């Protein structure tokens, strides 16, 4: 249950494969446009690895789904994402997140 | 409630010197045309789009 | 009523007046002290070839920087006391009778 | 909004848009790379006029192509579709520039811009004298004749003279014209045509209200023609012999009527052309009926207005000859001034101002609560003095000075010491008429005082607050030995400046102002609270009346997805409906009145509100095929006019549904047809606009009805649930002000333009990146 659309083309042969570590720079809003997070921000890339369970899993489908050097923009239900928890401070309970996400390298 | 804060970037814009319009009696046609074509853009030249 | 002396000195004071640097401020005021009391001209003048030493000193205030910046750069020492008691005189004078 | 198109994607290297304009149904869409795409923007307003623009930020490069001698286009346009070029004025050349600015670089320094002067969409349509009424004067029958027969010997001298002689057919390459004959023996329609032109004249100076008359019997008889060599006859032994009129001198109200006669004439023939269906183009079209100088006479070029002009000149000559004589007021200025916190209180100061341009400017000294809406010496907040003609203005106006020239700097000094101001021009003193040397005197302290300058429209200025001491053209000549110095001396940046920006926003009404009053009542066991306007200087001699432009401070938002006597607890607990009405008293026709909503981004204050003018939008979108499957209507202002509702009062009621986005209205308990609709995420303010005509004006009500809910209950988190009406102290009206001040940044992006050539058009180019840092206030949507 996500909703994904295409900003700009990618490689279109190249995916994500078990065992592999992915590269990505994004920046996360609200869906009222406030904007709550963005790697780019720290000049850094964020790093995480697949079926390990270190992120939300919105994000993780999201990203099997892209090809390499595609930009995308990736929509999360609150039930996929914090739920009707949240993030004490940053988000509240059931909230909507939209990614703008960029897959930089494969490794 | 409370104020925020951000970094953004400017903008501008530019225009060529023609107008065009529409009225009773005016000596103006009424259709026009015009193309545009990009040469080079960053997608990312600082941490906005 | 306004004379045409005042007038015409008026006129041409600011010439007289850059025709001295800003760094013998002090000695015209010095001039003028002693031109309250009744100093013979030539009294002020061989007192003044002794103490020229009291003239400002480049260090010092920022104003005078920006200044002697200016006074430097136009297209061109006992002159130097003659000229500040010449200038303290009329001075003194034309501040006598405000 | 999302729209549909193949291989949709943002703009990238390679890729080529083309837009599309039709003003005969309001509609505008675009195709990518030749294709089409699914969305069309239609039905909005025509109130002036409209131009190709393109916005970036730094890192790009982009080409415009215009077709003709400039970018040729790589797809051919749809039919009857024209290139941009063709819409060139005669008196204009093609360049790219910016969009309204106030500042752009200078030889030396950056210059100071005010307004522009803009056209506007109704001086495109002419304006001829040409009425219904006919002259047609016995009187004047027998000059009609005598003046055709001599606008025809000119006429055929000017053709004799370029090289034409006679013909019975007409040959432009080989210049054959068969009216190179005897007026009288021109074929009788031409000679008829002649004559019509002749009278034409003659009724268009009595339309313009010449007196025309014979005064000089004598005059025709001792008219002379003139004799022209054998070279100026033709093989039909024609010879032009216009008449000598070298004695002839135009009085001043006849070569105005000349100036007169010509523009009309232009007009009228202008006007017929229109009608005729010709329009304005670069280039002439005989099938296509267009002709390039299809413009009314104030825009056209010099070469033709003087030459139509003088065969009017002639004829008027001709006829002296024979013996008969004849005989927004706050985008028109733009202030500049410094930070408060530059402000003065003691020493002796000095800067520049240099004139660009000869007209409307002022400059001098203020203080630091100086209003952004009144013109610089009206009060008694400035000391300025005026160059266009000489004068200085504090509460007022008195000659001084002499007016400026072109290029000229003026020096503006104060001393604190003495409590003067003096002004200098070119390093000369301004001298006061009266004999005085100063131009104000005994001023007091007070707070402090401020460098300050206005430019009216079209002029330029630069000024120089002195931070470089060289830059300086005349302190050397007068200042330098009396004392002054340079405001802007022994500083590390340069002095950050504020103007003032005509972008209307709302603001509280001020508890003491002189002409309004808004009172806060308190809700009983019968009425609910409300807050009421009154004008407190009606019917005096000093009165003021004008349109207001109201709304409550705080909004009411919709829910982020839509769905697919006693109150009964469970409906009103689960319901989304919120209401609120307005009162107006009687003695305030309703005619005068508009009630409803109106979104975050309202700027208009229009001095004559109509329904009509509100600014309105519809985008569709559709398939592949065509068939349009979503249609939406957007505008940022929702009112219903009292007048459809038409002594006693009148109450309004207002409804909402936040779960479904609809609105409704109700006139005396009454329900109405028209209703709105919206989209998720919008925001709302309650407003209304009137024209007051009576010492009670309006009267905000924040009741409730039955089963619905008051908006103190949607406006305030902690009410979510409390059905009692309330009114908190941070709930209070606004007003729409026009002017206010605004802070000039540093810095500013660098833009390059050129023509790269015939074939790829101009370009333009930013590479420097800049950023500032934003402050957002969440409530009213701005930063």
Not at chain 4, 289 to 302: A, G, I, S, W
Not at chain 4, 739 to 760: D, K
């Amino acid at each position: 249950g996500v909703e994904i659309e295409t900003i700009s083309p990618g490689d279109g042969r190249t995916f994500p494969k078990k065992g592999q570590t992915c590269v990505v720079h994004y920046t996360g809003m609200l869906q009222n446009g406030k904007k709550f997070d963005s790697s780019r921000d720290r000049n850094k890339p964020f790093k995480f690895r697949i079926g390990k369970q270190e992120v939300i899993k919105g994000f993780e489908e999201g990203a099997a789904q892209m090809s390499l050097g595609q930009r995308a923009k990736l929509t999360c239900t609150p039930d996929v994402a914090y739920g009707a928890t949240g993030h004490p401070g940053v988000i509240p309970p059931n909230a909507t997140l939209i990614f703008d996400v960029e897959l930089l390298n494969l490794e | 409630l409370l104020l925020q804060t951000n970094l953004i970037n400017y903008v501008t814009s530019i225009r060529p010197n023609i107008f065009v319009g529409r009225a009773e009696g005016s000596t103006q046609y009424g259709k026009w045309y015009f193309e545009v074509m990009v040469d080079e853009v960053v997608p990312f030249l600082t941490a906005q789009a | 009523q306004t004379s045409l002396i005042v007038a015409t000195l008026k006129k041409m004071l600011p010439i007289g007046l850059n025709m001295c640097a800003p760094t013998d401020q002090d000695l015209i005021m010095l001039a003028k002290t002693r031109y309250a009391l009744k100093d013979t001209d030539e009294e002020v003048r061989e007192f003044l070839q002794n103490n020229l030493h009291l003239q400002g000193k480049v260090e010092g205030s920022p104003s005078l920087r920006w200044q002697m910046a200016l006074y430097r750069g136009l297209p061109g020492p006992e002159k130097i006391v003659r000229r500040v008691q010449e200038v303290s005189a009329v001075l003194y004078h034309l501040e006598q009778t405000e | 909004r999302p729209v549909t198109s193949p291989g949709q994607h943002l703009l990238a290297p390679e890729d080529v848009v083309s837009c599309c304009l039709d003003l005969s149904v309001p509609s505008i869409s675009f195709r990518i790379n030749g294709c089409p795409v699914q969305g069309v923007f239609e039905a909005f307003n025509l109130d002036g006029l409209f131009f190709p623009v393109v916005s970036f930020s730094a890192g790009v490069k982009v080409r415009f192509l215009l077709g003709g001698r400039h970018g040729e286009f790589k797809f051919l346009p749809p039919p009857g579709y024209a290139p941009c070029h063709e819409a060139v004025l005669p008196r204009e050349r093609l360049r790219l520039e910016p969009i309204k600015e106030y500042r752009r670089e200078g030889p030396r320094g950056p210059h100071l811009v005010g307004p522009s002067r803009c056209l506007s969409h109704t001086d495109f349509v002419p304006c001829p004298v040409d009425t219904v009424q006919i002259v047609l004067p016995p009187h004047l029958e027998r000059i009609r004749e005598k003046l055709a027969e001599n606008i025809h010997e000119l006429w055929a001298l000017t053709r004799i003279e370029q090289g034409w002689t006679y013909g019975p057919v007409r040959d432009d390459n080989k210049r054959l014209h068969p009216c190179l004959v005897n007026f009288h023996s021109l074929p009788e329609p031409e000679r008829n045509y002649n004559l019509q032109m002749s009278g034409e004249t003659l009724k268009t100076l009595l339309a313009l209200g010449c007196h025309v008359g014979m005064a000089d019997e004598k005059a025709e008889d001792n008219l002379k023609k003139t004799k022209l060599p054998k070279t100026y006859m033709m093989s039909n032994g024609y010879k032009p012999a216009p008449l000598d009129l070298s004695h002839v001198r135009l009085t001043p109200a006849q070569t105005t009527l000349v100036d007169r006669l010509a523009e009309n004439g232009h007009n009228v023939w202008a006007r017929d052309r229109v009608a005729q269906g010709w329009s304005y183009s670069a280039v002439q079209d005989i099938p296509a009926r267009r002709n390039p100088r299809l413009v009314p006479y104030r825009l056209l070029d010099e070469a033709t207005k003087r030459s139509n002009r003088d065969s009017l000149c002639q004829a008027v000559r001709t006829l002296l000859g024979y013996g008969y004589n004849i005989e927004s007021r706050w985008d028109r200025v733009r202030i500049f001034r410094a930070e408060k916190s530059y402000t003065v209180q003691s020493g002796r100061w000095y800067f520049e101002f240099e004139a660009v341009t000869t007209g409307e400017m002022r400059v001098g000294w203020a203080r630091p609560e100086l209003r952004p809406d009144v013109e610089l010496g009206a009060d008694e907040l400035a000391y300025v003095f005026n160059g266009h003609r000489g004068q200085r203005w504090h509460l007022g106006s008195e000659p001084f000075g002499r007016p400026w020239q072109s290029g000229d700097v003026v020096g503006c000094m104060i001393d604190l010491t003495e409590n003067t101001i003096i002004f200098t021009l070119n390093g000369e003193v301004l001298m006061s008429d009266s004999g005085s040397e100063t131009a104000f005197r005994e001023i007091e302290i007070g707070d402090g005082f401020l460098p300050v300058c206005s430019l009216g429209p079209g002029q330029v200025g630069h000024l120089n607050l002195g931070q470089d001491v060289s830059s300086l053209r005349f302190f050397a000549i007068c200042g330098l030995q009396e004392g002054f110095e340079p405001f802007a001396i022994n500083m590390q940046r340069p002095v950050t400046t504020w103007f003032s920006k005509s972008l209307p926003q709302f603001e509280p009404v001020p508890p003491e102002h002189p002409h309004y009053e808004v009172a806060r009542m308190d809700g009983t066991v019968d009425t609910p609270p409300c807050l009421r306007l009154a004008h407190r200087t009606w019917g005096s001699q000093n009165s003021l009346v004008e349109m207001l432009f109201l709304r409550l401070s705080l909004p009411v938002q919709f829910h982020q997805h839509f769905r697919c006597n006693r109150d009964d607890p469970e409906i009103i607990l689960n319901t989304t409906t919120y209401y609120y009405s307005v009162r107006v008293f009687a003695g305030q026709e309703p005619s005068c009145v508009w009630v409803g909503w109106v979104t975050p981004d309202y700027h208009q204050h229009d001095m004559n509100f109509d329904l009509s003018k509100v600014r309105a939008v519809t985008v569709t979108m559709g398939d592949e095929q065509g068939n349009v499957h979503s249609s939406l209507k957007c505008s940022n202002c929702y009112m219903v006019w009292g007048g459809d509702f038409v002594h006693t009062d009148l109450v309004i009621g207002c409804l909402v549904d936040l779960a479904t986005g609809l609105m409704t209205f109700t006139a005396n308990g009454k329900e109405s047809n028209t209703f709105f609709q919206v989209e998720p995420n919008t925001k709302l303010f309650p407003a209304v606009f009137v024209l007051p005509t009576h010492q009670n004006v309006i009267q905000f009500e924040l009741g409730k009805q039955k089963n619905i809910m008051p908006l103190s209950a949607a406006m305030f988190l902690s009410e979510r649930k409390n059905p009692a009406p309330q009114c908190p102290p941070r709930l209070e009206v606004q007003m729409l002000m026009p002017v206010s001040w605004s802070r000039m940044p540093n810095h500013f992006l660098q833009v390059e333009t050129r023509r790269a050539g015939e074939r790829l058009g101009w370009a333009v180019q930013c590479q420097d990146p800049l950023t500032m840092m934003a402050l957002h206030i969440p409530e009213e949507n701005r930063c």
